[PDB]
């Protein structure tokens, strides 16, 4: 897990070869950053840090760097992004790398180098020689996209890394408020750990007082309330947005993005595709795809198409000429509530 690596780095356990994979790029990024903070010194970072992207860079140069002594430092850091040849994708499109030299390197790596493969794919091809070599010689870490329940456990465990705790109710509420984004959970957990001072436990009350419901979560909820005929609850959500000075045009764009998502999700769901395949097809986090799937059940295809076109018209009427922007939005939302 991400936590195994993070805890290891803090104990001074830094290994010569890592393979960080999975589609949760934020955790890949955060981990690469912690490894950097561990091995690189700012005074020598020009000399002891190298980043390559195998989409455009030669593997051999990354290896030649890895085999160079650190310069006025104890360790060197070499980062190698996008080993697409670890997957089963169409191999004709890009650079034809020297995989065998890489296999050789990870099997006998330079003791003074920390070599990190950053492979933002869900799955590596287990049949590939190099994949087998990594599972043996590299510290493998998967940063997968989480569902609702997994996201709660992640939040609970995250608090522990700061020597605090958070109960499952408080954690579930936090995850709800930030609409499941891990980057937001990480941020809010750090704020909460500081906030509670000497106290050990982040309470549900701490979460509610400190953590603001995200705009994107508000948009989601506004749409729930509307499709559920809860007239005042949804008028209240909309008002609060305006009242904290969100721009009507921005509110509209987010509403538009969600309705487009619902239509797409409904389209693929009705062909039997699951939360899993839809997220990867749409390049949207499964957490957010699940919610769109739930909402898609409450609208017909024809409604969604109408709603979407209404929003494109509003976008144009707002961007061009002088119509009352808030009024345009009021009318739209009122139409939705009668209809």
Structural account:
- This protein is of the alpha/beta class.
- It folds into 3 domains: 1-143, Rossmann fold, CATH 3.40.50.300; 144-213, Helicase, Ruva Protein, domain 3; 214-339, Up-down Bundle (Zinc Finger, Delta Prime, domain 3).
- It has 17 helices and 7 strands.
- The strands form 2 sheets. It has a 5-stranded parallel β-sheet with strand order 2-3-4-1-5, with helices on both faces.
- It is found in: Cytoplasm, Nucleoid.
- One of its GO terms (biological process) is DNA-templated DNA replication.
Q: Could you give the topology of this structure?
A:
Elements: H1 2-10, E1 17-21, H2 25-39, H3 45-48, E2 49-53, H4 59-66, E3 76-81, H5 99-107, E4 113-119, H6 129-137, E5 139-142, H7 148-160, E6 165-166, H8 168-177, H9 182-195, E7 201-202, H10 204-210, H11 215-227, H12 231-243, H13 248-269, H14 275-282, H15 286-296, H16 301-319, H17 325-338
Parallel strand pairs: 1-4, 1-5, 2-3, 3-4, 6-7
